[PDB]
């Protein structure tokens, strides 16, 4: 009764605040063109399918994680390897790079987050306390980290004490990914209940909830200015949302796309949006006007992870055939 | 000049170590007990690995795709729920070509084999058992599965 009335009121307010679309205002901008990109590097050292990857702050080093139980640190300029770290548990599905560059993190089906130190490689900490498998983890600092788990919760930890500083709760499905804002004051989350949520790190409470998809949400990322975000789902669509307007603006889909979306990322200026799919290749979308402008197709299995440099000079894609490809 | 020499020397040792783990990875067979803990054992100079998942929720549609390269699935048997889960696993996209070792009389076996032989196009089978005998049974079914895979590879089946 009360919940239905509140939902109806929120819907009416949402309809009232909307007067124009993103397509009508961007009907005069010049189109991007045909984006043609080719493979510049090929990194091949893993034995099983790759699950996650993260770039580095200097845009030259990156870390990769695979289901065979290994963490590999690369040098994309010379293709030479740097560090190879074996893991205690073979089922790892996330990895992260510290902004300073002297820490890495990983986690998976063991419901534990492990942090390793590179400037000694020996393990530094083993945070436990979740009830389900970890899906994502992002560093904020040398002593702060945010994680999301399969028990429908997110967490903010303190590495020095090894304890859980804050717990974010309210989702009704497995939380799949998280994305941290440039201001580091808030972040966003998506789960399997077909909804996304905005969390404030300082206070620790949910501020806004967005509901536009029809199935589970797989990937999420922030826009460069921090005033919007995009998310991909299992219904073969992508959607862009807004914070000051609090509603969806644009959707990206095609009539011949059936598979779901696994990864999502943005370009330097926000003009391009990269989406990895389950049909072995990934697409490029124009953010201002929803229109496909390029295809990266070199992998024999499904693309699982996607990243773009901090300088915007190259993109890196991992896959289930155990290869990492750099495109530019 | 010296930095590049050091970098190449560092990469060479990594490659030499990595080439050692591939032989260990291809010589072991993985299993999955579906009634995370890991148990490794050896039978007739053959390495075997088994994992059990019981620390997760009863929503398997997301963490079950991590086990798409396993050799076989050990299903321990309410009958209708087991049949429905068997049908759900049998028709998945990533776990499509996966054999199931049942551990349960002839009526139930026939009902399971009815859904087992409905589809598959001769890519996976079902091995029902009525229960140090279990390990031997699993060993025999694994040998049969790998032999059939090799037969398909060499164009003899």
């Amino acid at each position: 009764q009360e919940a239905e009335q509140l939902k109806n009121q929120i819907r009416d307010a949402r309809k009232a605040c909307a007067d124009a679309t993103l397509s009508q205002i961007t009907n005069n901008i010049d189109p991007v063109g045909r984006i043609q990109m080719r493979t510049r590097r090929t990194l091949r050292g893993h034995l099983a399918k790759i699950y996650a990857m993260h770039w580095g702050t200097d845009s030259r080093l990156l870390v990769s994680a695979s289901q065979d139980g290994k963490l590999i640190i690369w040098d994309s300029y010379t293709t030479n390897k740097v560090h190879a770290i074996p893991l205690r548990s073979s089922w790892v599905m996330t990895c992260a790079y510290a902004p300073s560059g002297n820490y890495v993190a990983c986690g998976g089906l063991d419901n534990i987050c492990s942090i390793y130190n590179l400037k000694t490689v020996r393990v530094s900490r083993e945070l436990a306390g979740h009830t389900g498998y970890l899906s994502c983890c992002r560093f904020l600092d040398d002593n702060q980290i945010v994680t999301s788990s399969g028990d429908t919760t997110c967490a903010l930890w303190d590495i020095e004490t090894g304890q859980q500083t804050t717990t974010f709760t309210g989702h009704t499905g497995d939380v799949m990914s998280l994305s941290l804002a440039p201001d580091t004051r808030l972040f966003v989350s998506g789960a399997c209940d077909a909804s996304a949520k905005l969390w404030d790190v300082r206070e620790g409470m949910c501020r806004q909830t967005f509901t536009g998809h029809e199935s589970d949400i797989n990937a999420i990322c922030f826009f460069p200015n921090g005033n919007a975000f995009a998310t991909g789902s299992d219904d073969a669509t992508c959607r862009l949302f807004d914070l000051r307007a609090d509603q969806e603006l644009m959707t990206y889909s095609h009539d011949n796309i059936i598979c779901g979306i696994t990864s999502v990322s943005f370009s330097k200026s926000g003009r391009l949006l990269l989406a990895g799919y389950d049909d072995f290749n990934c697409n490029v979308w124009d953010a201002l006007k929803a229109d496909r402008a390029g295809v990266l197709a070199g992998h024999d299995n499904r693309v699982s992870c996607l990243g773009v440099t901090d300088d915007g000079m190259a993109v890196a894609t991992g896959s289930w055939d155990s290869f990492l490809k750099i495109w530019n | 000049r010296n930095e590049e020499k050091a970098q190449r020397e560092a990469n060479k040792k990594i490659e030499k170590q990595l080439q050692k783990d591939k032989q260990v990875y291809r010589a072991t067979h993985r299993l999955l007990l579906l009634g995370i803990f890991e148990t490794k054992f050896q039978v007739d100079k053959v390495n075997f690995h088994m994992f059990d998942v019981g620390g997760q929720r009863d929503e398997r549609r997301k963490w079950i795709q991590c086990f798409n390269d396993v050799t076989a699935i050990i299903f321990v048997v309410r009958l209708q729920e087991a049949l429905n889960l068997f049908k759900s696993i049998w028709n998945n996209r990533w776990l499509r070509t996966i054999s199931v070792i049942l551990f349960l009389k002839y009526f139930i076996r026939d009902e399971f084999l009815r859904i087992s032989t409905a589809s598959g196009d001769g890519r996976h089978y079902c091995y029902p058992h009525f229960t140090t005998e279990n390990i031997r049974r699993v060993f025999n079914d694994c040998r049969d599965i790998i032999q059939r895979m090799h037969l398909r590879q060499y164009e003899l089946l």
Partner: nanobody
Amino acid sequence: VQLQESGGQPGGSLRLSCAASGFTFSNYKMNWVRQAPGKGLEWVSDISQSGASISYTGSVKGRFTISRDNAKNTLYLQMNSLKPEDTAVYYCARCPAPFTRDCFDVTSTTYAYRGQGTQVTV
């Protein structure tokens, strides 16, 4: 995603309807599940995207009929000669992913794509 269920002496007849909003009804596989008092959730009946393939549990095979209407995005369950052993709360579940032949977690507790249920006592 919203699913609303409505409707509901031994040997009688009854009919339940369920209306769906928020998603494309045509390309999803739908099903009826039941929860009896003293037991857990159970699977009752299934129906495909176009109604070509229909599946029933052995307990109610023959007595009950499940149908679907894509023009009005609603589905129906018709039960005849109901027995007192059929008193339970009926839910309408929806398969999580489109264009798929697998439906994993419809009988799980804390499922997200399931309605509120209607009580039937016979």
